[PDB]
Design a protein around this ligand. Structure first.
Ligand SMILES: Nc1nc2c(ncn2[C@@H]2O[C@H](COP(=O)(O)OP(=O)(O)OP(=O)(O)O)[C@@H](O)[C@H]2O)c(=O)[nH]1
Ligand SMILES: [Mg+2]
Lengths: 177, 159
């Protein structure tokens, strides 16, 4: 018996600059700074949500995207229930690299929920990863995709609620009727 | 001057001489008024030895006691990149929120140094603080996280 009814670890991964920390701050504090502060090692937020009469505590880990500033890889993945994989819809490279991030998950995790996030969807003139192409890819991987803007606060709450429900469902599907 | 003998032997990783100083009545928390009120445990940090830090803590050293610039053992270990000493101090209840007289805490120092390993230990220890404050799945094993990190960085200015 604890303060929460369920505890889940969520891990945010993806290339440097794509908006991982910004998505986390928007969800956690409803703020967006506009400034870029490079994540060194790891950062985190702990937040609770109420779902179907139960308190769910989210321990949300935020990785450094730059290899130079990452710690030992197994530290990020250990105990993870859900992984949030982020690219930047204005950066083709960040989307190309999604398959590398998916490989990293597979080398470190046996059985986790996943969600794909195309962030910075707030400037049509600089968008290079088209919605349809991203959804097609997501479909082939069997993973849900959300296109978000941490800056404009679009689909951030929806994305975090989705991966929360996925991990809750994964847990409950293994418990009694 | 048994305190001074202990102080010197701590830098020098000399546990028998440390023990001898203690047997003669050295204060394990002796402050050297001639050298910024630094302590045996701060000397142990500067000397780079983990086992010397352990010995002092086992014999009653205050893990938080500061020099005259307001810098404790954890501050100094962070500045020198002594990852193993940072891990030990965090597990022994060191106050990582302490700021020195210039207003800096260990996390700000580690972030400015872009030190992934030490930032990771400091942040995961904070996560444990936050998990506890709301009141193992709830408890990060930072030793396990430390166990495959480098114990130090010899390219950093240190011994
Ligand atoms: N236009 C726009 N910019 C964004 C958005 N989200 C983040 N940014 C900007 O993108 C830059 C990088 O944001 P971060 O959240 O720090 O990126 P990150 O993935 O955490 O980067 P690393 O910590 O280096 O791995 C910052 O300048 C942000 O203000 C967004 O939704 N739209
Ligand atoms: Mg970041």
């Amino acid at each position: 018996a604890r303060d929460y009814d369920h505890l889940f670890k969520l891990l945010i991964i993806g290339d440097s600059g794509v908006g991982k920390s910004s998505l986390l701050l928007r969800f956690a504090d409803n703020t967006f700074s506009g400034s870029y502060i490079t994540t060194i090692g790891v950062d985190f937020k702990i937040r609770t949500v109420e779902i179907n009469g139960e308190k769910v505590k989210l321990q949300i880990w935020d990785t450094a995207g730059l290899e130079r500033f990452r710690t030992i890889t197994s530290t990020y993945y250990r105990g993870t229930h859900g992984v949030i994989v982020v690219y930047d819809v204005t950066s083709a490279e960040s989307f190309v690299n999604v398959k590398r991030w998916l490989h990293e998950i597979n080398q470190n995790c046996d059985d986790v929920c996943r969600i794909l996030v195309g962030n910075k969807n707030d400037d049509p003139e600089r968008k290079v990863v088209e919605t349809e192409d991203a959804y097609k890819f997501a479909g082939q991987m069997g993973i849900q995709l959300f296109e978000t803007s941490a800056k404009e606060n679009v689909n951030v709450e929806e994305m975090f609620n989705c991966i929360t429900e996925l991990v809750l469902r994964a847990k409950k599907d293994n418990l009694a009727k | 001057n048994p305190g001074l003998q202990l102080y010197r032997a701590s830098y020098e990783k000399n546990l028998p001489k440390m023990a001898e100083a203690l047997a003669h009545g050295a204060d394990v928390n002796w402050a050297n008024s001639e050298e910024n009120k630094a302590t045996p445990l701060i000397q142990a940090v500067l000397g780079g030895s983990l086992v010397t830090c352990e010995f002092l803590l086992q014999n009653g050293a205050n893990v938080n006691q500061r020099d005259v610039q307001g810098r404790g053992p954890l501050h100094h270990a962070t500045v020198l990149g002594h990852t193993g000493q940072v891990c030990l101090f965090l597990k022994r209840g060191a106050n990582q929120h302490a700021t020195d007289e210039e207003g800096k805490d260990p996390l700000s120092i580690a972030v400015e140094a872009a030190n992934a390993d030490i930032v990771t230990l400091l942040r995961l220890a904070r996560m444990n603080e936050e998990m506890r404050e709301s009141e193992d799945e709830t408890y990060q094993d930072i030793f396990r996280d430390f166990s495959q990190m480098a114990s130090n960085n010899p390219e950093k200015l240190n011994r």
